[model samples]
Target: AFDSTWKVDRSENYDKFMEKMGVNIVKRKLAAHDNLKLTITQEGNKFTVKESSAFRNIEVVFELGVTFNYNLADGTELRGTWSLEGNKLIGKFKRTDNGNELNTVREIIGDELVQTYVYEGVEAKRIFKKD
Candidate 1:
């Protein structure tokens, strides 16, 4: 089951990636080390995720094949839906501001939960461990 509370354990090249996304130095610096926590629950094809971070706290609810709007901390808005493929959760989203595609994948690698985010041509990863 994917129902659990997790906290960010590590991140790689997240600041550079955010900078590429047009985030300023101040926001990028703060976001790079933001203490992010997540509580997720899934039931059948629907899911709910509660996110808390130094930047903001929000709750997200969506179902498979249903599109919803999600706003990033940097003020970017996206519309997308998440679908499961085998052991991974694949997210397909498009930026409403510029129509740029944003993609993400979630998978468990050993003892860590890995989240890979791709926008434009830059890629970044933020990993978490169950707490």
Candidate 2:
């Protein structure tokens, strides 16, 4: 069902979440307030996700149970795959430079699109409204 464009309304504990991910503090503005948008396209589980913002235009392509690489704004690299269950796209991608894994998720909660970044037990949520 996540086959449309959505923009985040706000975030929760995203500052702390960035600390856990080792992201640059200077790019916070670029990451947060650049009019971020996420668009999804699914064709038989071959999912293609595009992240757009003032600073970046990123395309992430993957399939259910297939491994793929994902990159962050400050050059933190990750590798993982997503699974579908219970109306949620459950993704667990691991940081390439570290041994620990990060949990990234997307799901529909009522009228909103909810996504979370959980790194080393510290979690942050970015809830979105459809466009």
Candidate 3:
């Protein structure tokens, strides 16, 4: 179930969220249309994520409730764990530099994949369509 390829469709409040993350205006403008795509495969409690964007292409393998390290496209390092709650995948991460928490959630809503990000009180949503 959560196994599919998704392409970014649109975003809400993403600019503000990026600003909160200290992204510059030019980068934010470019990122607004980063053309992000994700291919997710789940086998039991283990998951493999293939990520592609205007910034980079990478693959990550992680297990439920297991801690791992991930870096943002902007080069921000994060240590975190991802868990499944009902049909949602929830991620809790701490910035390696400032130790601030960044929370993310991935959920399927109707025909769209909705990913929400929260950091320092600002929240943003990115919606994707199945490809």
Q: Using TM-score, give the best candidate's number.
A: 3
Off by over 4 Å in 3: none
User: What digit string (tens of lDDT, one per residue) describes model 2 on residues 1-131?
Assistant: 89989987999998888877876787764566767799989999898889988878999989999988888776888899899987899998898998689998898888789998899989999998897
Candidate 1 has its poorest 10 consecutive residues by lDDT at: 1-10
* Candidate 3: residue 64 Cα off by (Å): 0.6
Ranking by lDDT: 3, 1, 2
lDDT of 1 by residue, 1-131 (tens): 56788899999878878988889999887887789998999999989999999999999999987999999987799999899999989999999999999999989888678999998999999999998
Per-candidate TM equals: 0.96, 0.93, 0.97
RMSD (CA, Å), candidate 3 to true, equals 0.7
The most accurate candidate by lDDT is 3
lDDT tens per residue, model 3, 41-100: 999999999999998999999999999999998889999999999999999999999999
Error of 3 at 36 (Å): 0.3
lDDT of 1: 0.90
What TM-score does candidate 2 get on C-alpha atoms? 0.93
Pull out the clashing pairs in model 2. none
- Tell me how candidate 3 scores on lDDT: 0.95
